[PDB]
RNA sequence: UGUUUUUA
């Protein structure tokens, strides 16, 4: 229950369960599979 | 729930009163086995003997004197008592220690209550409206070195500000590395001839630093801080022999040399009442 | 339908123990020893389960029970560190987990009198005799198959050895809260205590930490018949079971 | 009604009505019945 | 669909070997190592299968390949007698049975020339240099991880070390009948030979008898480029697999 | 039946 009109008044959102480390770990054009030769 | 069943005369080859304690078993022998009994009911749940009730009420664990005074011309603010640090332990006040040490492993969420009370033993015109900062310093975090150091900033450290005379109250989840705290540890940090026995970081709750955030007045005000700990959602394992002899050190099973007998010698022989 | 609960046989690996005067075996906390399950596991390394090469009865060098014997204490797995393949695995691995079948043996005639308390104490943290904050040194807490004789003298950096205070500042009479069995010579010649793995962690270092401690304590003193040798041998036989080792590695060097 | 996000914030659990003294009183391999000879 | 047969990874226990210039692994006699089945078993004792604590790659102290190197010979399981938990089990048990993944390593530039013959010889019974009916002494046939250097001098009671005659009176060129692989520096930097258990008996004493013998023999001599160090390291890495031990017992004492 | 509960 929110006691205020403003969205800024609300509490923190907790956790974004949506992770995707790929955008940082694998920012590659061509797909690279673990096990496959990185370059060929 | 039945406490005592109705039971009449017994002429039987089943002798519930005869056993062998050599087995290490305590046979659940009842009054109904030794006497003629009437039916009675418990009218009792055993609510007060639950470990959450037994271990789960507040107790003083630490008391510390800190002074709000001018910090000019002081080189160590920790040792001048402008701030004091407490390595969090429940093993310093013996009454609570004995209760916890009825068990080997305890897993509980904590609930701390910090009560700061001021005193101006010397000439003072008024009772200053001091605000104490209680700062939780987990291992690795920079322990405060000065009373207004950059550490107190507590950008990531949990910190509480409360008025002296008033109190603070905060919950702390189970912070142990293991699945439970060790009340006893028959081991070492590593295989070393001179390393510490019993003492281990398995029980490093962390540390608590206390300062008065107020600048100085002309008068010295001594603030005695009392930390109270209440265990919640208590789980306990492996019941132990109760502590008999007094303690000597935190985290050690050590007892004094030349300590007094704890078994209460009789007046008269073994036959006396 | 006739038979006996005093006549028992325990076969582990290539080792077999028999007894004809047994008191009902104790299973500490009604929990049999088991391998660590995947839901409690933390270490990702596949555990070495050494089977029958280590899961076997190792008999410990016998003790002499005299009229003036205060008692004896062993630490596990410490006591078995020099025992066959178990000891090797103990030193070659970072992590170890093991239950134990302890079997204590003390036979006498029907003329003998005396009672031993055989008790298993988890996390038997010893007290220093020097008091204060003095530590008990590694060498004294890890004696091996020799164990600690409580009738012996104190040593600098050594533990306190007043059996009355359980070496820890608790009273002897209360040790019965721990999984225990008596060897009452009139009734019993053998105690047996099956110990599961007891720790706050799923697996632990076997070298730096002793999970359980076996104590054999004379309560009722040995009273031998007239003209008899005022001594009885006490033999301790321990078998690891559900033993797991993880993180194989160069052999660990320990003090001494 | 819990006023906080954290489980640690909640009150005590009251009582575990589940007792079993057997694990301490009768930690024996073979079953021992009251009345039966303890050893045979 | 693209990829490579020269790029290989072998993971055994906590050990992993990688190669990027591998020649197709040899599986001696197209037979993978396996545990002994009940229909071939003679010994009634339940075998200890030590799993990943022994079934792992042990790297042997490197050899130096010079222009004048004749070759090197290792005996198994002898070579691994001092290797971790495998060695302990080897000495603590009466009977042992094990297959092996041998991995021989010799890297060089594309300017280097030379060819090693990596060959596994079952029952490599060595010949004495003294001729007649002179026996080869235990100490010389069981060198350990050191192996036998064939470039070395003869020793009294020692084996013959003319690599041309395979130390046994057979010719070098015919060793190719045995499961073998070449390390041809232009093609290959790693040989791999998976050895099953080969014996007339289902299980045998590991101390008195060597089932197989690993020989690494320079055929085409090392020709280094101008100004290079006239040496290459040869590293042998061996992993026991499907290892079984039976008849645990006091540790065996061997000569030396 | 030298039988132990439950209900009028």
Swiss-Prot record, chains C, E:
Summarizing the function annotation, the protein's role is: Forms an icosahedral capsid of pseudo T=3 symmetry with capsid proteins VP2 and VP3. The capsid is 300 Angstroms in diameter, composed of 60 copies of each capsid protein and enclosing the viral positive strand RNA genome.
Q: What is the lineage of its organism?
A: Viruses, Riboviria, Orthornavirae, Pisuviricota, Pisoniviricetes
Organism, as annotated? Human rhinovirus 14 (HRV-14)
Name the UniProt record assigns to this protein: Capsid protein VP2
Q: How does it assemble?
A: Interacts with capsid protein VP1 and capsid protein VP3 in the mature capsid.
Q: Where does the record place it?
A: Virion; Host cytoplasm
**Part of the intact protein present:** 76 to 331 of 2179
């Amino acid at each position: 229950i929110n006691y205020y009109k403003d969205a800024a008044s609300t509490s923190s959102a907790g956790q974004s369960l949506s992770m995707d480390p790929s955008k940082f770990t694998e920012p590659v054009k061509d797909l690279m599979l673990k096990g496959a030769p990185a370059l060929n | 729930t039945v406490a005592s069943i109705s039971s009449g005369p017994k002429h039987t080859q089943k002798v519930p009163i005869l056993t062998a304690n050599e087995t290490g078993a305590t046979m659940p022998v009842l009054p109904s086995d030794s006497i003629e009994t009437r039916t009675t009911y418990m009218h009792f749940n055993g609510s007060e003997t639950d470990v959450e009730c037994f271990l789960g009420r507040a107790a003083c664990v630490h008391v510390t004197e800190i002074q709000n005074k001018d910090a000019t011309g002081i080189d160590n603010h920790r040792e001048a008592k402008l701030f004091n640090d407490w390595k969090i332990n429940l093993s310093s006040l013996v009454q609570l220690r004995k209760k916890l040490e009825l068990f080997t492993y305890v897993r509980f969420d904590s609930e701390y209550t910090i009560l700061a009370t001021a005193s101006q033993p010397d000439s003072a015109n008024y009772s200053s409206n001091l605000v104490v900062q209680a700062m939780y310093v987990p291992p690795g975090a920079p322990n405060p070195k000065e009373w207004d150091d950059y550490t107190w900033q507590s950008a990531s450290n949990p910190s509480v500000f409360f008025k002296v005379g008033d109190t603070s109250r905060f919950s702390v989840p189970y912070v142990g590395l293991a699945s439970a705290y060790n009340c006893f540890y028959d081991g070492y940090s590593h295989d070393d001839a001179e390393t510490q026995y019993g003492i281990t970081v398995l029980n490093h709750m962390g540390s608590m630093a206390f300062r008065i955030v107020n600048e100085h007045d002309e008068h010295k005000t001594l603030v005695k801080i009392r930390v109270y700990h209440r265990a919640k959602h208590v789980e306990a394992w492996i019941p132990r022999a109760p502590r008999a002899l007094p303690y000597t050190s935190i985290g050690r099973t050590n007892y004094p040399k030349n300590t007094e007998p704890v078994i209460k010698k009789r007046k008269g022989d073994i036959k006396s009442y | 339908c006739g038979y006996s609960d005093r006549v028992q046989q325990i076969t582990l690996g290539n080792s077999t123990i028999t007894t004809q005067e047994a008191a009902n075996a104790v299973v500490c906390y009604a929990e049999w020893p088991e391998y660590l399950p995947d839901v409690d596991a933390s270490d990702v390394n596949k555990t070495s389960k050494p089977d029958t090469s280590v899961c076997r009865f190792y008999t410990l060098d016998s003790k002499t029970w005299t009229t003036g014997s205060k008692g004896w204490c062993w630490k596990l797995p410490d006591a078995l560190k020099d025992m066959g393949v178990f000891g090797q695995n103990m030193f070659f691995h970072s992590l170890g987990r093991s239950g134990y079948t302890v079997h204590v043996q003390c036979n006498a005639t029907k003329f003998h009198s005396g009672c031993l308390l055989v008790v298993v104490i988890p996390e038997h943290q010893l007290a220093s005799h020097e008091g204060g904050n003095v530590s008990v040194k590694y060498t004294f807490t890890h004696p091996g198959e020799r164990g600690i004789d409580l009738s012996s003298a104190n040593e600098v950096g050594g533990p306190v050895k007043d059996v009355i205070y359980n070496m820890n500042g608790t009273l002897l009479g209360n040790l019965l809260i721990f999984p225990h069995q008596f060897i009452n010579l009139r009734t019993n010649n053998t105690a047996t205590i099956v110990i599961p793995y007891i720790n706050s962690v799923p697996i632990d270092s076997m070298t730096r930490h002793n999970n359980v401690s076996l104590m054999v304590i004379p309560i009722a003193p040995l009273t031998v018949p007239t003209g008899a040798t005022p001594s009885l041998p006490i033999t301790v036989t321990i078998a690891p079971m559900c033993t797991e080792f993880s993180g194989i590695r160069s052999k660990s060097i320990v003090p001494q």
